[PDB]
Write a protein that binds this ligand. Structure first.
Ligand SMILES: Nc1ncnc2c1ncn2[C@@H]1O[C@H](COP(=O)(O)OP(=O)(O)OP(=O)(O)O)[C@@H](O)[C@H]1O
Ligand SMILES: Nc1ncnc2c1ncn2[C@@H]1O[C@H](COP(=O)(O)OP(=O)(O)OP(=O)(O)O)[C@@H](O)[C@H]1O
Ligand SMILES: Nc1ncnc2c1ncn2[C@@H]1O[C@H](COP(=O)(O)OP(=O)(O)OP(=O)(O)O)[C@@H](O)[C@H]1O
Ligand SMILES: [Mg+2]
Ligand SMILES: [Mg+2]
Lengths: 305, 130, 250, 229, 290, 337
DNA sequence: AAAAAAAAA
């Protein structure tokens, strides 16, 4: 299952609108998606599969290994102890896909780093006069869980991520995977798992005409095509943002208060429409892309209940 | 102890949201150069304006005026908003208003600009009462 | 072997306060210990006179003679001889039990466990001092040490009775020491009213009659026995003589 | 006390009071000190020394200082209805340490604030150097260092007036209430003696006149006038 | 040979101390102790050294001090009453005068009245302090019973009662005196502590404040404001007269014959005459009984 | 045999010592194969003794205490060899137990920091060391058994199970089986256990008298050591007669374990699959109170329990009886009889 | 490089 999560992963792979705008204003094609769900939903396995299929993917976590954040991998490395270092940098943060599990686990240092890599902002932490900043242009994909370990009937922002709301508002797309006990879905899940176990392989019950190396080729092929923006959707996206602020007029109704006012919502809508044009379409952005981005946002919010 | 303070409150309205949408979409689709920096350096180095006796009366009148508003027809002893910090803020703002345009002595325009720009923030500094 | 000295919270035990909030040790730590003794201070001026006499004697001017006679009359042995004897006994002997002793220990353990349950069902909180199978092993070890003292290759009832006596002392002093911690009190005043009203000074009545009367009424047996023995604990108008039959009013 | 990690320093570091030896320490915002300093101070002033014993190093340091502090009454504005103890949150034992108190209030009088603003403006632009004190700073320092070389004594009538004044000051304050007003100790008598000596020094006189005692008593009484108002 | 630093009371504030090396010949061995401020009269000498020249680049010479006399100056800073290396030593005629004046009637009254001659009243405090600083006789019964022979004194009262002055006089009076105060002392500061020597790199023992108070008095001020963790570490010092350490594989017991004199203030800053002592102070029975 | 009761605990230990097989896929990466068991209970209920027995009877095991361990030194250490003059990694406690079992006591008293070092092992059974210029992944495919006390002195049956256990749910979800034990006071059980414990203490080693303590013995007479089927000397196992049901000795049981862990690799079938899916669907939708929440990973536990039970009876196929017994054991461990 | 004691936050 989880077709919409995989669709969001596809939209993440292609990337959004990029290569700057007039008069030097900065825009990034990277998409930031945070996944929420209870333990035991195979979100970690999905992240591992994404890292496998993405050649630029990197997996990190809060400590466990020290030389992965805020420090260069060559610090104090040479036998001469030449103190080779770039200063403030991350692991392959240039055009990389950073994947993190237990997003609430990391300490203040890695939290500061992930806040510093916001919106293609370079890391300029200095210690001994070094300022060789790493130009971080990366897409952030993280998975986390509430501290309760289960969804709660109370106000959903009280569960949130246990992270500052400023960091939460940065993310383009928020998904919530809540486990609902039912017969007609758990039967299918158990049947799928047991049929996988019986064959000791990926079963023929799966029906996929396309292959992982084929996706590896086609993602580069579709990235090469690189459609650009068409102006005819400006009025439609403006009125959609007007209706989004109309929703912001009802965010005080509470119990799913995440429908807050943020220009980054509109920017992410534009980027997602651009990515929808990029994934298959030629050098043209369709209103259907805007509609699909809107539907994806509504589905993202609808998981709150 | 700050010299000034400013507040931004984004509230959802049709007109301003429409204007921001149009403006940012057009950006998505008269500006000087380091000349500004050299002008700033020249003003900081070669310009040392002073205030004049004419503006002293206006300063005193403004201080009294905000002292006048600090009390009303009730003996509650309303909050004393006319602090000496207000005086020093007005003085510095007026002197800086003489700093640009390469002037050497202050005029009235300096003091009215200073008092307007200092009381605009105060008028938005109130809480839910009044 | 661990020999530990400790002081309760708030200095003196403060028996008016509940036993639960007088000891800060958890259940896990207390179970490993198996001989806990509560040394409470007392005042009756006779033990006090005796202690003062003993200290004034134990000053160096007198004890240096008297203690010497303890090695001259054979009452006590020197420390080094005790060390030699104890290491010899540790090396040589290692006793064993007998089936009658096992039966006695089993019955005693069942009895104390049932008594603990009886206290717990009334106090409606968990006991601050637990009784577990570790305690049964403890009594077994105490019996073995008592038999080991006299180099006996087998342990018999003579040592078992002393071990059970010591365990009962160390149990009633700490665990079962006032388990109540101080229908509520409404029946207590009601029960205090009738005995003053119905039974004057100098006369007496059978326990069976009162128990029958206040089981027929609403008081029931559980409330009466506690009230009766606490009116006795007050000890200013109620006296028991002639076994548990004669309820004499002093 | 500080030490480098696995480095044999065991060295003490000097606070502001340590640096202010034989001088004047000026503390601003006295209200928000913490427990350690709040309990070290009332030993620092009265005994003129500080003692510490931590982690194997012990010492007794000199802290001969004169302290001057400023405070802000709780709630922002001083409540004239209450007293010094009611308005201030700082503790009673620290109160007895100090020798003098000064409370200064602002108001909304239109006459005063206009003069205040005018005086500020005059020194800002017109006469930034042309202020008129009766004496120059050099003359002030000359007189200060000349008067510092005098040690006054006390005479018979001075002692009699002093003991009478101390008796009166102990009596009139203790007559107010019990278990609510406790402010006069031997420290007050010592402070009165010190103020008399300082005033005698100011006039460059090797003896003390009961008028100086009267002035010191007036200052101390006005310290208790201020708490009443 | 020993390393000599600068006295913290003599160094200008905020600066660093200066180190020197002192060499003690025969009869001077173990006279000085770690942490004890001393005054040494000696001879200044200089000698050649290799790596000092190597690292400085100039013909510089190392200097050491060959000690000739040592005088202890810990606590008792009053150094004007009499002269000599040890002011606590007596001649034969001084002993004869001691015996002559020790036989007059009412000598205890004169001794009590001669203590702190500039503090008025408080006769009971003077008597208690005299009885505390004269001490008793430790008792040993058959080598298996020990009885403490020192007296502890606790002072409690209102401010402005010259408790600190009396404590300072006691510090000036006793042969061995250690002054602590309030929050300025820690639990492991009074007791002996465990430290790693930077040279030989292994755990060792460092003498605490109480060890310096052995055969002497330990004076504590502001006893109430000291934290409970820093207060519960002197029970053995007041009662068992022994300090036991089991830390970092080091198991040793240290002797401590010290008399503790403490001052404090009651709750609220003043003493409520109409209340019991249990509601006047926050101390408990185990500390009050000692 | 000297522990009274806890029969289901014994069955769980038996199934854990010879757990299921590990799975590797060209696309599915790796699947965990063995079983981990955690027990929580009030003091003096014979947990540490069972842990010592498991140490003694296992092919390979390492004893670890929560307080007396450091997580960084638990996995690997950096030591400089005296001869070569270079620094090389020294194997930690858990790495030595590869393809073994690790027992940890006072688990709830063990420092929180080092807990993450355990979780990594519970994640992919591999520890990564990146320090001082060494970057290596070390295999550690061991099983872990632990016993911990509740937060209070005694278990409160009226409280939230999460409330009684100090460990976070993140690692508690990893353990396949959670057991809660309590010493309910009952005079019948008290008498039975008293008789049993007294019976145990009245024991004497063969050929040695009761008047003197145990003395140390020398090594074997032979420094290096080394008619069939008609004797059954130690094959039947019943050394002493106490019950109609049989018993087996420790050496024969260990030989059985050695044979089973190597000679048989069972394959599951659809008949047990139907029972497994039916009981998972039933247990998930019973909709009543339970000790712990259940999720998709429990079906994996059922599969490997059925595999272990197929291994026990030495069959290459999994029958529905193994599914039934696994479901019964899980219901006991989560519902209670 | 890794374990263990101390004072300040
Ligand atoms: N939809 C699913 N299909 C198949 N297996 C699933 C599914 N959801 C969960 N699983 C199972 O869950 C396990 C992986 O989920 P896992 O618990 O590691 O993820 P998680 O939700 O990030 O939790 P945690 O933080 O506890 O690791 C696997 O054993 C997998 O078989
Ligand atoms: N007879 C006396 N009684 C009390 N104080 C006296 C007496 N004679 C003189 N004084 C003076 O009174 C002051 C009392 O000292 P101090 O303020 O330290 O007392 P304290 O109550 O012990 O102090 P604190 O407890 O605050 O440390 C000293 O300055 C001392 O000179
Ligand atoms: N069912 C039992 N059969 C035999 N002995 C038992 C039984 N239950 C408890 N015991 C005895 O209880 C004692 C306590 O042992 P142990 O400390 O290992 O138990 P535990 O439950 O693990 O306790 P803890 O929580 O303190 O570790 C042992 O001497 C053991 O023999
Ligand atoms: Mg996960
Ligand atoms: Mg145990």
């Amino acid at each position: 299952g989880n077709l919409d999560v995989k669709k969001a992963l596809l939209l993440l792979l292609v990337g959004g609108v990029d290569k700057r705008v007039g008069d030097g204003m900065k825009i990034r094609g990277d998409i930031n998606v945070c996944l929420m769900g209870d333990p035991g939903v195979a979100k970690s396995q999905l992240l591992k599969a994404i890292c496998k299929i993405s050649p630029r993917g990197v997996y990190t976590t809060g400590k466990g290994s020290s030389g992965v954040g805020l420090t260069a991998a060559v610090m104090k490395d040479p036998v001469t102890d030449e103190m080779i270092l770039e200063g403030g940098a991350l692991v392959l943060a240039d055009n990389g896909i950073c994947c993190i599990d237990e997003f609430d686990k990391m300490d203040e240092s890695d939290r500061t780093a992930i806040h510093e890599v916001m919106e293609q902002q370079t890391i300029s932490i200095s210690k001994a006069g070094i300022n060789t900043t790493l130009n971080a242009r990366t897409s952030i994909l993280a998975a986390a869980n509430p501290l309760y370990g289960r969804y709660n009937p109370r106000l959903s922002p009280l569960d949130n991520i246990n992270l500052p709301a400023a960091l939460l508002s940065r993310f383009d797309i928020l998904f919530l995977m809540l486990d609902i006990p039912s017969r007609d879905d758990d039967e299918k899940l158990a049947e799928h798992v047991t049929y996988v176990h019986m064959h000791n392989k990926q079963p023929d019950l799966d029906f996929t005409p396309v292959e992982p190396s084929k996706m590896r080729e086609y993602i580069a092929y579709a990235k090469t095509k690189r459609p650009v923006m068409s102006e005819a959707v400006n009025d439609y996206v403006v009125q959609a943002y007007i209706r989004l602020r109309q929703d912001s007029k009802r965010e005080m109704d509470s119990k799913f208060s995440f429908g807050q006012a943020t220009p980054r919502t509109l920017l992410g809508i534009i980027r997602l429409s651009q990515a929808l044009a990029k994934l298959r379409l030629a050098d043209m952005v369709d209103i259907d892309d805007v509609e699909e981005a809107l539907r994806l946002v509504r589905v993202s919010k609808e998981s709150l209940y | 102890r700050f010299d000034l303070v400013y507040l931004v409150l984004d509230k959802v309205d049709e007109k301003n949201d429409r204007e921001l949408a149009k403006h940012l979409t057009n950006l998505y689709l008269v500006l000087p150069v380091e000349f500004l920096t050299m002008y700033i350096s020249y003003a900081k180095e070669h310009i040392h304006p002073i205030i004049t006796e004419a503006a002293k009366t206006e300063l005193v009148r403004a201080y009294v005026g905000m002292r006048k508003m600090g009390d009303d027809s009730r003996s509650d002893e309303k909050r004393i908003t006319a602090t000496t910090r207000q005086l020093e803020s007005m003085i510095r703002l007026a002197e800086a208003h003489a700093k640009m345009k390469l002037k050497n002595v202050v005029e009235l325009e300096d003091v009215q600009e200073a008092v307007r720009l200092i009381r605009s923030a105060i008028k938005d500094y109130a809480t839910d009462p009044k | 072997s661990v020999l530990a000295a400790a002081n309760p919270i708030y200095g003196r035990y403060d028996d008016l306060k509940s036993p639960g909030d007088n000891i800060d040790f958890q259940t896990t730590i207390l179970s490993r210990f198996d001989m806990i003794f509560i040394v409470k201070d007392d005042h009756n001026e006779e033990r006090d006179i005796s202690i003062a006499n003993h200290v004034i004697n134990i000053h160096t001017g007198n004890a240096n003679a008297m203690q010497n006679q303890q090695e001259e009359n054979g009452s006590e042995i020197s420390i080094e001889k005790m060390k030699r004897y104890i290491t010899y006994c540790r090396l040589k002997c290692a006793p064993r039990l007998s089936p009658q002793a096992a039966e006695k220990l089993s019955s005693n353990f069942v009895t104390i466990r049932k008594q603990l349950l009886i206290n717990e069902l009334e106090s409606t909180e968990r006991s601050s001092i637990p009784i577990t199978i570790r305690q049964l092993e403890a009594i077994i070890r105490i019996t073995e040490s008592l038999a080991k003292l006299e180099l006996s290759p087998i342990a018999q009832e003579r040592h078992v009775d002393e071990a059970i006596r010591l365990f009962q002392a160390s149990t009633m002093d700490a665990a079962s020491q006032d388990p109540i911690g101080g229908t509520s009190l409404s029946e207590i005043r009601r029960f205090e009213q009738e005995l003053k009203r119905r039974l004057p000074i100098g006369w007496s009545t059978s326990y069976q009659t009162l128990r029958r009367e206040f089981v027929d009424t609403h008081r029931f047996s559980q409330l009466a026995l506690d009230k009766a023995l606490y009116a006795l604990e007050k000890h200013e108008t109620i006296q028991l003589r002639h076994q548990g039959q004669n309820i004499y009013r002093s | 006390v500080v030490r480098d990690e696995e480095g044999g320093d065991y060295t003490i570091e000097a606070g502001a009071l340590m640096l202010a030896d034989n001088g004047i320490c000026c503390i601003d915002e006295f209200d928000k000190m913490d427990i350690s300093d709040q309990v070290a101070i009332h030993e620092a002033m009265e005994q003129q020394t500080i003692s510490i014993a931590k982690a194997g190093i012990h010492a007794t340091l000199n802290a001969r200082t004169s302290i001057l502090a400023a405070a802000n009454p709780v709630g922002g504005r001083y409540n004239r209805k209450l007293s010094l103890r009611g308005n201030l949150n700082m503790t009673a034992p620290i109160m007895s340490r100090f020798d003098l108190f000064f409370v200064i209030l602002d108001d909304c009088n239109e006459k005063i604030d206009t003069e205040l603003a005018s005086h500020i403006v005059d020194l800002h632009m017109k006469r930034d150097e042309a202020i008129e004190p009766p004496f120059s700073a050099e003359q002030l320092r000359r007189y200060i260092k000349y008067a510092r070389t005098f040690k006054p004594i006390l005479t018979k009538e001075a002692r009699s007036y002093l003991v009478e004044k101390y008796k009166e000051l102990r009596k009139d304050d203790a007559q107010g209430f019990s278990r609510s007003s406790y402010r006069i100790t031997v420290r007050q008598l010592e402070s009165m003696i010190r103020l008399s000596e300082a005033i005698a020094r100011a006039n460059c006189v090797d003896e003390i006149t009961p008028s100086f005692i009267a002035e010191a008593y007036d200052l101390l009484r006005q310290s208790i006038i201020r708490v009443d108002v | 040979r020993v390393t000599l630093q600068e006295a913290p009371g003599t160094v200008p504030p905020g600066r660093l101390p200066r180190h020197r090396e002192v060499i003690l010949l025969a009869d001077l061995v173990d006279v000085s102790k770690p942490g004890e401020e001393v005054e040494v009269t000696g001879i200044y000498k200089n000698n050649y050294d290799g790596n000092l020249n190597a690292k400085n680049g100039f013909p510089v010479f190392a200097t050491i001090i060959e000690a000739n006399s040592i005088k202890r100056r810990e606590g008792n800073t009053a150094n004007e009453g009499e002269e000599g290396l040890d002011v606590f030593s007596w001649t034969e005629e001084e002993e004869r005068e001691f015996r002559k004046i020790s036989r007059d009637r009412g000598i205890i009254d004169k001794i009590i009245s001669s203590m702190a001659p500039s503090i008025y009243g408080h006769r009971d405090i003077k008597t208690a302090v005299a009885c505390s600083l004269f001490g008793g006789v430790p008792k040993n019964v058959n080598g298996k019973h020990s009885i403490r022979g020192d007296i502890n004194v606790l002072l409690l009262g209102d401010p402005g009662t010259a408790k600190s002055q009396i404590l300072k006089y006691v510090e000036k009076t006793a042969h061995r005196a250690v002054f602590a105060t309030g929050q300025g002392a820690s639990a492991v500061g009074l007791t002996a502590s465990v430290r790693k020597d930077p040279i030989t790199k292994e755990w060792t023992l460092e003498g605490g404040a109480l060890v310096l108070a052995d055969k002497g008095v330990c004076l504590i001020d502001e006893f109430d404001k000291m934290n409970d963790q820093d207060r519960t570490s002197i029970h053995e010092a007041m009662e068992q007269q022994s300090i036991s350490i089991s830390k970092a594989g080091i198991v040793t017991t240290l002797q401590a014959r010290c008399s503790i004199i403490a001052a404090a203030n009651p709750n609220g800053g003043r003493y409520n005459s109409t209340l019991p002592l249990a509601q006047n102070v926050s101390l408990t029975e185990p500390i009050l009984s000692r | 045999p000297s522990i009274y009761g806890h029969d289901h605990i014994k069955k769980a230990i038996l199934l854990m010592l010879m757990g299921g097989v590990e799975k590797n896929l060209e696309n599915g990466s790796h699947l965990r194969g063995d079983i981990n068991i955690l027990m929580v209970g009030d003091p003096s209920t014979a947990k540490s003794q069972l842990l010592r027995f498991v140490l003694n009877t296992a092919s390979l095991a390492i004893a670890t205490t929560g307080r007396g361990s450091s997580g960084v030194g638990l996995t690997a250490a950096v030591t400089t060899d005296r001869e070569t003059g270079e620094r090389r990694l020294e194997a930690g406690a858990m790495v030595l137990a590869d393809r073994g079992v690790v027992c940890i006591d006072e688990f709830d008293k063990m420092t929180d920091v080092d807990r993450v070092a355990i979780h990594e092992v519970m994640e992919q059974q591999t520890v990564t060391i990146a320090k001082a210029g060494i970057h290596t992944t070390l295999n550690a495919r061991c099983s872990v058994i632990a016993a911990a006390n509740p937060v209070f002195g005694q278990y409160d049956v009226n409280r939230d199970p999460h409330q009684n256990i100090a460990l976070p749910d993140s690692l508690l979800s990893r353990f396949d089986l959670l057991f809660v034990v309590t010493d309910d006071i009952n005079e019948i059980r008290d008498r039975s256990i008293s008789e049993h414990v007294l019976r145990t203490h009245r024991y004497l080693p063969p050929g040695y008298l009761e008047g003197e303590p145990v003395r140390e013995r020398l090594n074997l007479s032979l420094a290096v050591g080394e008619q069939a089927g008609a004797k059954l000397a130690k094959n039947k196992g019943n050394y002493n007669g106490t019950e109609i049901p049989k018993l087996v000795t420790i050496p024969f049981l260990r030989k059985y374990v050695q044979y089973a862990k190597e000679r048989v690799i069972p394959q599951l079938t659809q008949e047990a699959i139907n029972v497994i899916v039916k009981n998972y669907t039933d247990l998930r939708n019973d909709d009543n109170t339970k000790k712990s929440p259940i999720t998709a990973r429990t079906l994996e536990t059922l599969i490997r329990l059925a595999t272990a039970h197929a291994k026990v009876r030495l069959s290459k196929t999994v029958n529905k009886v193994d599914a039934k017994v696994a479901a019964n054991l899980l219901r006991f461990a989560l519902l209670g009889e």
